[PDB]
Design a protein around this ligand. Sequence first.
Ligand code: 3C0
Length: 381
Amino acid sequence: TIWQVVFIAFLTGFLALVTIIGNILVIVAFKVNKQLKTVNNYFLLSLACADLIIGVISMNLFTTYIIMNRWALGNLACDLWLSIDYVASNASVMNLLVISFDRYFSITRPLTYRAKRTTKRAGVMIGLAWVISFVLWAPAILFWQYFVGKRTVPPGECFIQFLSEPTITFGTAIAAFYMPVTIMTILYWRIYKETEKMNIFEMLRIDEGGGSGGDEAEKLFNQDVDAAVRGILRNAKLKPVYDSLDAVRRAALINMVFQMGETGVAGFTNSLRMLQQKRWDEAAVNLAKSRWYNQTPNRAKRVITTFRTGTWDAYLIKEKKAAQTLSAILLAFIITWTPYNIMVLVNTFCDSCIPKTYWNLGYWLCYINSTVNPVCYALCN
Ligand SMILES: C[N+]1(C)[C@@H]2C[C@@H](OC(=O)[C@H](CO)c3ccccc3)C[C@H]1[C@@H]1O[C@@H]12
């Protein structure tokens, strides 16, 4: 009847504005605050831009196609709305690929990539993403009916002409969803597994606020770490303490030797006794009331915490939070776009087995994915 139409228009209207509000609020928080324009947060701007377009146009136009059950906007308004919807969502999956590429190279190759992530290279990746999405859809939707010589799409309805064949649509489905999802699936596991994955060499790197050095600097750094341990073994007051410590707290001991020298570390008599006597809680308070905690508090606070917990929980707080963001992003993407692509996968091997009702619900389900992304920004960061 029409009673369900009213309810349909209310629910679809609610999701339209809340997507827009969420996206606009993100952009304002990017243009105002100069502390949110980072490398990874710059890619979240392109996502907020693409999702905003869908919320203001695609969400508003596709609703009328369901309500009136007919397209009454013309032929020039049809091919444009499809181009807008397909380019923005294609730039969207390109943005997600760039986001997933940044974290994968920052973990796998932290020596020759972490110091290469600039704003210049970030602006190009986004710029190219929007251009590539344009070349693949705009001519294929606008200038395909002319190459044929006629418009296959009948008046009153609206759909892409070159995607009439289920075979082509399926091929489009794989390269565009199945292939990026499987890639981002492999990347995410590589990032989540290589979380720790944490040695002394990188431990010092953080405390120094240090950066990735050359290939030769790694040869010298290893010799310095190896020679530091030899000095601890030579030391008659450090050797018994160092030997009783585990591989995690051993490195934390070298952290102080690298800083204050072997002799300076040997000063903490009461602390070293507590470390050998497995009294971690008492040594943490003890090391926090020295001159070392007052000279370099942030460096000490991470070393002291390493002693207390016995884990690398003081050097992964920024990296684990970076994985929680991507986890919330790809989860919403594979839970919404999948039921549509499942149908595309199925529709390829049959004729009439998937109702237009399910194609509509499968279509609208992907729209709300653009709404979760602004929420994931306030749910993680
Ligand atoms: C708005 N949608 C609902 C349409 C259908 C789906 O997209 C797809 O599944 C296909 C590939 O399977 C696709 C279309 C365009 C761009 C990339 C993929 C989700 C989004 C996307 O803009 C389209």
